[PDB]
Amino acid sequence: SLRNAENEFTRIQQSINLWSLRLPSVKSLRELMLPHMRQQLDELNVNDPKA
Amino acid sequence: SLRNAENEFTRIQQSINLWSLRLPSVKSLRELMLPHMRQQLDELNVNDPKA
Amino acid sequence: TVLPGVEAIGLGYNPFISYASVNSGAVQLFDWATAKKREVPFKAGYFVPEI
Amino acid sequence: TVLPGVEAIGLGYNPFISYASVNSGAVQLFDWATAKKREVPFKAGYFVPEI
Amino acid sequence: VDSVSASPDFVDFVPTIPMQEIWTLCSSEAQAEAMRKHYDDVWAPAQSEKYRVKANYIDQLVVITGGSSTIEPPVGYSKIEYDLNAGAGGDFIYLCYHEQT
Amino acid sequence: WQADRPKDAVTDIRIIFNKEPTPPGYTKLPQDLNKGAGGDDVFLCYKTEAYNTDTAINKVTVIGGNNADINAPYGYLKVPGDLNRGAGGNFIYACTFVGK
């Protein structure tokens, strides 16, 4: 009788990083938002939770 | 019976240094800060710890 | 030219669906095609919104 | 040209999250795109804020 | 790698300020509080439930009475190893389970 | 398959015995499945329907063994009445499966 077994596994990870973008969360940021998005936000009838 | 074992380890560190930047912490430095950041700082309602 | 990634920041986002990917999160909220643009100091010829 | 790293100094920073990296710390506070610039004496053609 | 230098994609957060709540962008504190309250009380619970791992679980138990080590449970069931009379007399009785995939 | 104008003889099945008459609509098979086994005479019958992909019996099988009640496979239903009712040997039961 003969029994012969092999197992093999590899894992590789590679990562590259390049520049990060940050946004300061100042109050004037609302003025930079797209107008159709802005009116969509402030037309939200928050009296309806489903909305 | 035969038993045969190997262990190997390497650690390398390489470092390069280039010029350091220093900022003098003079009081006039506040005048160089970005205006939206400045007003965000001084609009802080420090009466609220959560803010 | 715009700096790559300026289209991805400000993207409306859902944190529960998946880890950091443009496929979690809906639509760009900000008009940064139109905002005032600054050149990025470490890459000549690439611009971002001043914010 | 700006000296590399002048975008990183003055970055608002959190000391607890991690050791020295641009990924600890939020957003640049200072308008150094606009401040008065001095040429750095040991690298011709590179400039920094006079401060 | 050359293409990554020309066209990197969003891969990871800046861990200090990764994202801002949308109601920070709101016009009004009443709306913003209503959005926050609904987010806190309703939507974030639902979404965290929606994406909670729906792990595998037992569908049913049945019992098999083959009386020996040779027995195999009904089709699709899996038997537990110890018989419920180990070291006793009588028949070897085995509990077996179906798991809902 | 559900070819056009599909058909189905087997919405449900029942085991019928002692040579009692079936209610109508159940087609009854003629052979005694205990012939020479002794016991009661036992027969099988099934009811025809239109197909609907979820009432129609998708699979059918038989179970049996030493135990008087024996467990059907997962999702199968055993049919009441022993297919060796009063006869020798193992208890035996038909089993039916439906997709939901």
Ligand SMILES: [Mg+2]
């Ligand atoms: Mg026991």
